[PDB]
DNA sequence: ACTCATGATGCACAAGTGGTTGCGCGTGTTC
DNA sequence: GCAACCACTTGTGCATCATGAGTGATGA
């Protein structure tokens, strides 16, 4: 099973504890767990309407030549497609 | 679908019964739900349990668990077994995360019918001992023969590892021991029984609708666990007892090797498939009304006039 | 032949020698384990390992419930590990003759003034539909609550009339009590007679016996005396738990379950919904110590 | 190639930029990348000798029931073994 | 010791196991905190240079000295893919410390019979349905040209795109047509990948067999093995499916990266570079 | 037959039409691209894409070096993208007779430990810069074989005994206690390399070792942008401040 | 001109403590 | 009694800025 990584910040503490039921916390707001496509999709679905006014970013194994892809919703660091290659973009203040 | 809230999860969002971890053992701690998380709070620190990935949670001595923690564990499909000393002390589980009772209906139809129950018991005996043929054995003969061969296996494994065994058989009903072999056997068996109880509660099967064991609410748990107690728990417990040295926690290493054997033997998927085949269920809204002419009738409808 | 259904909430249960120690806010109570038949651990309950071990040694049925059993969360083994009710239910539901008889008996329980021993399943379900329509109409007339048709969404509770929300909440509270009683008695919630294919078919079958008598009037009263913007579901659940406080309903449920399973009256058990601080006088002679 | 995740905080900026040459940084101090055992081991050895007075925790795919195992060096959250199941332990102040 | 910004070849992924290419334009490649950082007006993108073989530098890229040093340290070759073909090459020290491949390539390029045999194998690999056991050098050039124009014409007719009877050349191939842009983008990606692989394996890019006279001849020879198989059909498909207002270069690079991943051109390229030089 | 070796550092190179533009602290220098030859881009250099394109059009060998070529970091193509020197070196190195002859020719031509290592590494960097600019393959070495820089080591062995050794011994004698001897050795080696005579001699010996005919040889011109303004003004190199 | 180390300097976010409310998560005879 | 929400302090670390020092990673 692909390893799914979710990072939460400025989210309600309820979701902070809720994600621990599926995937553990290795650092403040960092989660890692092994799931298939369906469980991962449902878990990101749960995170989307539980994070409130917070930032969530998820990384999972994909079928690109880097080997992973990114899903972010209302996050500081967006993801830009450099010709079929996912690279993390950090906007400048 | 519907609104998503912390602490409550659907069956789809959870892993399959055969795709989860086997068990976790907690002792001298205090399971407690803080911020919608099953948290184990020991003296030093707090440990968060990924209950969605855990099949059964084993509660040892000195373990305190709250009401909301039990509700959360039941919601995640994780079964609760108070695995104290002298074996399993109690069972607990929430609603089954399987909304279809087809497995349970088939199990009931098989156990009520005497010929079907005898056939199912013969199938279990054949699965335990594939080489033999038991097409003519009766129920009492089946029980006596299974006891005799379990005792023979215990004696053989005691001879192999050179450990003193007092011609005894493990039994969840009041089995106590102080020898390291007894402790290892108890640990492996309680882990197996917790896993079996979790699987049965997850599939919707009734733990009381047993075929080989009768007389209590966990007879089917014993029946399912006997299919694997001799092939994993006994040899692994004997190996643990042989390997154990002075000043070593027998339970810790016994459960470690029990999990290793469960992973290597693929006990979880094997148990799911064995329950599939034992009930003679071919591979394939759940609720409906009952009728004689039309069989199932759609529910949630009002029949006027 | 007597089973006590003890309800515990807002307490920490431990064990001393052979008795559970319910450390309430009022004080400490020392119920002997042997007298407890069914333990209904309500909200705010911290159960210990030794308490669970002692209660399971004496065949107690631990059921983690809501406030007065409105919600069923988890349950342990059966009352005294008695699977005779489960075996009887499985035998009754397996074949069509006993299933027909049990369905007729439940429909008769729902039809005190009519004889339905000759009606078919189609006729029986039509009669229940007519009965529930008439009950809804007459309760709407009595409580001055407008009623058009039972409309709701299992996935969208917010969108709906207050009467429908109250009905759903009260029915689910009744379902929780039914499941608590069933798990205490050792019955299988999935082995249903009229309802089939669901993991709580028997729960709905049993709760249908009390819907038209308990939860529907409660829901109609809640809808009548409700302000706009009020939590209808919480109100209905609280009213249902208040109705369940007495314990008469639970005893009636145990008796009706044993009647449905054709259990002979000699072998039938009697539920005793005991309370801790409201029944001190009854429990003191039984050995239940009290501290303050 | 299994997915590997390294989390850094209170580390020199040199390491923060250096790990971006191997694995991308989805959020502050957390890195994701797909490497084999050799590359992951070399990256962890590089992290151990560059963070100095900092904390680092790494997550990678393993062969246990949870499917992953954890390596931490002077991290706030340690890792303890539950019968062969790595679960994160958070010490209490 | 381990110093930030410096790594050994062992710590880097093999030539096969890394991504193919990254294209950068209208940016400023820079090194901050020992990271290959690509700074745009809106923000900065930090590149995992250890996971990419070649970095294509499009128009508007202003790369610094230390950024080039870091990219060479990671083994990521640099190519300035401007308009009308590859414009300049760059590469750091080879992350292969053994020159067995280089010595073997030298000893098969100095010998005339060895050069003939290597060109024979490359023709056989490009066209396995023919026989070239007695075919000579200039005849090999003529046959290669005839077949590349035949492939170009066949693909132009198949995808229904007007082609002006030409074959892409790395030197001064300018065109405003969508087919010209797609061919240029796919070909510069291929040439950058070939240059990256050659620099990574320790081979000399100047020791060519069919192409001679310049220091990028072996790059052209290696790229010819895959030019007609992958890049030309990809460019023709891109021109066929291109819409109005769609950036030809971006979609062409999408398609050529997809072809490289599907065709396994990296592992295949290393394997071919092994077989052409007879490494058992 | 003139191959200028312009060393640019602390600058930002952009392109004006057919002329690169070097903007240092002293001022802005415009150079026609045809006379660049070898462009040694030292530290602090920010080369632009359009300048790279212009330099590539004119056969420029861009080599990213350290301070006065102490360290070799990266290189582009060769002088006029020519491979005659590389082909000659390959022909000499594959066969045994020419390899033995060239090895014999090299032999005929030919704290303290840390200083020696630093000086040798500086010489390696300069030799690699020259080799990459000329188009020679650093791996094809005669005396040394089996390494990516074997030819670099062979060429550096020519100058080890009379440049790097005296500098290393001088810095070892002059070293103060608790001082970075490697940095001192590198700085003294770059100071020695400032004049550029060593670069000319390396180019001359590289051409000689390949038996390149004297008529077809090209001579190195270690051009300085500011120290040689009077030499570049007639060449068309505009200056500004 | 580049890059890194360093010193202020401020700021967003997390973890703790403190009372206060509630006991919770709502389909199954609705087309 | 337990657990979530909430206010509110308290604090750790990150990012920016300005200054000054180096041009660097050191094997035949």
DSSP assignment of chain C: -EEEEEEE-SEEEEESSSBEEEE-SS-EEE-BGGG-SEEEE-SSEEE-HHHHHHHHHTT-EEEEESGGGSSEEEE-S-GGG--HHHHHHHHHHHSHHHHHHHHHHHHHHT-TTS--SS--HHHHHHHHHHHHHHHHHHHHHHHT---------SS-SSSS-HHHHHHHHHHHHHHHHHHHHHHHHT--TT--SSEESBTTHHHHHHHHHHIIIIIHHHHHHHHHT--TT--HHHHHHHHHHHHHHSSHHHHHHHHHHHHHTT--TTT--EEE---SSSSHHHHGGGT-EEE-
Distance in angstroms between the alpha carbons of the first and the last residue of chain C: 32
Using DSSP, how many helices (H) and how many strands (E) does chain F show? Answer: 9, 10
Distance measured from the CA of protein residue F8 to the C1' of nucleotide G2, in angstroms: 13
What is the CATH classification number for the domain harbouring E237? Answer: 1.20.120.920
Interface size between A and D, measured as CB pairs under 8 A? 83
Q: E strand or H helix at D59, and its extent?
A: strand D55-61
In a domain, F108, yes or no: yes
Asked if the structure places residue F130 within a domain, the reply is yes
CA distance B254 to E2: 42
- D71 lies within 8 A of chain A by CB: no
Same domain, F61 and F115: no
Closest CA to B220 of B201, B233, B235: B201
The strands making up A68-73's β-sheet, listed across from edge to edge, are A24-27, A30-34, A3-9, A55-61, A68-73
Burial of C185 (0-12, 13-18, 19+ CB in 10 A): buried
Question: If DSSP codes are grouped into helix, strand and coil, which group holds residue B2?
Answer: coil
Look at residue A16 and give its three-state secondary structure. helix
Task: Verify that B62 and B124 share a domain, yes or no.
Answer: no
Q: What would the two tokens of residue F155 be?
A: 């060429």
Q: Which of E42, E47, E267 to mutate: most A Cβ within 10 Å?
A: E42
φ, ψ dihedrals at F63, nearest 5°:
-130, 125
CA-nearest residue of chain A to B14?
A: A39
Q: Give the end of a domain, one of E69, E90, E111.
A: E90
Question: For residue B57, how many other CB atoms are within 10 A of its CB?
Answer: 28
**Interatomic separation, CA of residue F184 and C1' of nucleotide H22, rounded (Å):** 13
Specify the 3-state DSSP secondary structure of D20: helix
Q: B253 and B270 in one domain? A: yes
Pair B226, B127: CB distance under 8 Å: no
Domain of residue C122: give its range.
81-261
CA F218 to chain centre: 15
Structure-token match 């659940």, residue found: C237
Instruction: Round to whole Å and give the CA distance between F103 and F89.
Output: 12
Asked whether residue B41 falls in the same domain as residue B179, the answer is no
Q: Is C77 on the interface with B (CB under 8 A)?
A: yes
CA angle E81, E82, E85 (to 5 degrees): 75
Please give the nucleotide, over all strands, whose C1' is closest to the CA of residue C43: G23
**Nearest in space to C54 (alpha carbons), one of C108, C91, C17:** C17
Q: Are D25 and E35 in contact (CB under 8 A)?
A: no
> Which stretches within B113-208 are classed as H helix?
114-128, 139-161, 180-203
C-alpha F97/C-alpha B260 separation (Å) is 66
User: Which residues contact residue B300 at a Cβ distance below 8 angstroms, ignoring those fewer than 6 apart?
Assistant: none
Q: How many Å apart are CA F40 and CA D68, to the nearest integer?
A: 50
CA C229 to the chain's CA centroid: 29
E70 vs E90: CA distance, rounded Å: 13
Q: Could you tell me if residue B163 is inside a domain?
A: yes
**Rg (Cα) of chain A, in Å, rounded?**
13
Concatenate the DSSP letters of all residues of E21-81 into one string: EEEE-SSEEEEETTEEEEE-SSEEEE--GGGEEEEEE-TT-EEEHHHHHHHHHHT-EEEEE
Nucleotide nearest F114, from its CA to each C1': H26
- Compute the Cα dihedral for E121, E125, E131, E136 and give only its sign: negative
In the PDB record, what is the listed experimental method? Answer: cryo-EM
Q: Residues of D with CB below 8 A from A66's CB?
A: 34
Q: In what order do the strands lie in the sheet with F38-41?
A: E19-24, E52-57, E77-81, E86-92, F72-75, F61-65, F38-41, F2-8, F219-221
CB F119 within 8 A of CB F144: no
End of a domain among F74, F106, F125? F74
Checking DSSP bridges between strand B45-48 and strand D85-91, what pairing results, if any? antiparallel
Alpha-carbon separation of residue F181 from E115, F43, F120, F159, F161 (angstroms): 50, 21, 13, 21, 19
Tell me, yes or no, if D88 comes closer than 8 A to chain B by beta carbon. Answer: yes
Sign of the alpha-carbon dihedral angle for F115, F118, F121, F123? negative
Going by beta carbons, is chain A in contact with chain B, meaning 3 or more pairs sit under 8 Å apart? yes
Q: Which residues pair with A79 in a beta bridge?
A: A88
| Cα B267 to Cα E207: distance, rounded to the nearest angstrom | 61
Distance CA C132, CA B302 (A): 9
Q: Are B257 and B71 in contact (CB under 8 A)?
A: no
State the greatest distance between any 2 C-alpha atoms of chain E, in Å, as a whole number. 60
β-sheet bridge partners, residue C13: C22, C47
Q: Is residue B108 part of a domain?
A: yes
Structural domain containing residue D78: 1-93
CA of D26: which chain E residue's CA is closest? E46
Residue B4, SS3 per DSSP: coil
Q: Identify, with chain letter, the residue nearest to nucleotide G27 (CA–C1').
A: C154
CB contact under 8 A, B50 and A22: yes
- Tell me how long chain F is: 241
Report residue C4 as tokens. Answer: 């006590």
- Two structure tokens written together for A46: 């749960």
First to last CA, chain F: 32
| Helix axes of B219-228 and B180-203: crossing angle, nearest 10 degrees | 120
Question: Which residue, counting CA atoms, is nearest to the C1' of nucleotide H28?
Answer: F153
Question: How far is it, in rounded angstroms, from Cα E91 to Cα F63?
Answer: 10
Q: Could you tell me if B255 and D83 are in contact, meaning their C-beta atoms sit under 8 angstroms apart?
A: yes
Q: How much is the CA Rg of chain F, to the nearest whole Å? A: 18
The answer to whether position B121 is within a domain reads: yes
A88 contacts in chain E (CB < 8 Å): 45-46
Residue B62 DSSP SS3 = coil
User: What are the DSSP E strand ranges found in chain E?
Assistant: 19-24, 28-32, 35-39, 43-46, 52-57, 62-64, 77-81, 86-92
Last residue before each break in chain B (C–N > 2.5 Å): 284
CA of C24, C1' of H2: distance in angstroms = 13
Name the residue among B145, B261, B118, B236 with its Cα closest to residue B185. Answer: B236
* Residue B71 belongs to domain with CATH number: 3.100.10.20
Taking the C-alpha atoms of residue B97 and residue B170, their distance in angstroms, rounded to an integer, is: 31
The token duo for B157 is: 């494994």
Whether residue E3 is contained in a domain is answered as no
Residues 6+ apart with CB under 8 A from C20: C13, C14, C30, C31, C33, C36, C51, C54, C55
How far apart (Å, rounded) are the C-alpha atoms in residues C52 and C8?
14
The C-alpha of A18 sits at a distance from chain B's nearest C-alpha, in angstroms, of: 5
Chains contacting D (3 or more CB pairs within 8 Å): A, B, E
- How many domains does the structure of chain F reveal? 2
Residue E130 C-alpha, separation from nearest chain F C-alpha, in angstroms? 32
Boundary residue ending a domain (F45, F74, F103): F74
Check: CB of residue F239 under 8 Å from CB of residue F27.
yes
Which residue's C-alpha is at the least distance from the C1' of H3? B34
Q: Which of D24, D57, D59 sits opposite A88 (nearest CB)?
A: D24
What six digits make up the tokens of B290?
Answer: 């009952």
Nearest nucleotide (C1') to alpha carbon of E35: G3
- Measured between beta carbons, which residues in chain D are less than 8 angstroms from residue A61? 3, 34
Distance, in angstroms, between D4 CA and closest chain B CA?
20
- Say whether both B27 and B160 belong to one domain: no
> Does E197 lie in the same domain as E132?
yes
Interface contacts E/F by beta carbons within 8 Å? 139
Element (H, E) at E179: helix E178-201
Q: Which nucleotide is nearest to C151 (CA to C1')?
A: G30
Closest by alpha carbon to E20, among E174, E180, E195, E176? E195
Q: Which residues partner with E79 through β-bridges?
A: E56, E89
Q: Is residue B95 classed as helix, strand or coil in its secondary structure?
A: coil
Do the Cβ atoms of F56 and E87 come closer than 8 Å?
yes
Shared-domain flag, residues F113 and F134:
yes
Q: Collapse the DSSP code of B239 into the 3-class scheme (helix H, G, I; strand E, B; otherwise coil) and give the result.
A: helix
Distance F239 CA to G1 C1' (A): 18
End-to-end CA distance of chain A: 38
Task: Tell the burial category of C134 from Cβ atoms under 10 Å away from its Cβ (0-12, 13-18, 19+).
Answer: exposed
Q: Which residues contact C81 (CB under 8 A, 6 or more apart)?
A: B215, B216, B217, B218, C59, C186
The answer to whether the beta carbons of residues E45 and A87 sit under 8 Å apart is yes
């Amino acid at each position: 099973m692909p390893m799914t990584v979710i990072t939460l910040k400025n989210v309600p503490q309820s979701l902070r504890g809720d994600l621990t039921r599926w995937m553990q916390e290795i650092a403040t707001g960092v989660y890692v767990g092994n799931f298939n496509s369906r469980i991962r999709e449902y878990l990101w679905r749960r995170v989307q309407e539980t994070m409130g006014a917070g930032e969530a970013s998820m990384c999972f194994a994909a079928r690109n030549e880097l080997g992973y892809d990114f899903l972010t919703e209302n996050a500081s660091r967006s993801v830009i497609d450099y010709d079929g290659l996912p690279l993390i973009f950090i906007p400048k203040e | 679908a519907g609104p998503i809230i912390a602490g409550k999860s659907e069956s789809s969002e959870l892993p399959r019964v055969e795709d989860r971890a086997t068990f976790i053992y907690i002792e001298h701690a205090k399971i407690n739900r803080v911020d919608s998380a099953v948290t184990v709070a020991e003296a030093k620190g707090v440990v968060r349990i990924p209950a969605a990935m855990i099949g059964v949670l084993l509660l040892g001595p000195g373990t305190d668990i709250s009401h909301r923690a039990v509700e959360l564990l039941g919601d995640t499909g994780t079964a609760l077994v108070w695995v104290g000393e002298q074996g399993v002390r109690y069972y607990a589980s929430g609603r089954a995360l399987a909304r279809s009772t087809r497995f349970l209906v088939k199990q009931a139809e098989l156990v009520t019918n005497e010929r079907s129950r005898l056939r199912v018991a013969r199938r279990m005996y054949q699965m335990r001992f594939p080489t033999e043929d038991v097409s003519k054995l009766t129920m009492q003969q089946l029980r006596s023969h299974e006891g005799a061969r379990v005792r023979r296996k215990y004696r053989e494994l005691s001879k192999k590892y050179n450990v003193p065994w007092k011609k005894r058989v493990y039994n969840p009903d009041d089995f106590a021991g102080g020898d390291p072999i007894n402790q290892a056997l108890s640990a492996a068996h309680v882990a197996l029984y917790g896993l079996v109880h979790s699987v049965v509660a997850a599939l919707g099967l009734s733990p009381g609708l047993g075929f080989v064991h009768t007389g209590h609410d966990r007879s089917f748990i014993y029946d399912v666990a006997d299919l694997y107690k001799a092939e994993i728990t006994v040899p692994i417990a004997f190996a643990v007892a042989a390997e154990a040295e002075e000043g070593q926690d027998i339970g810790q290493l016994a459960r470690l090797r029990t999990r290793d054997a469960f992973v290597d033997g693929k006990i979880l998927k094997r148990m799911v498939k064995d329950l599939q085949t034992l009930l003679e269920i071919p591979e394939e809204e759940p609720l409906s009304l009952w009728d004689d002419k039309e069989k199932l009738v759609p529910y949630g409808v009002n029949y006027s006039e």
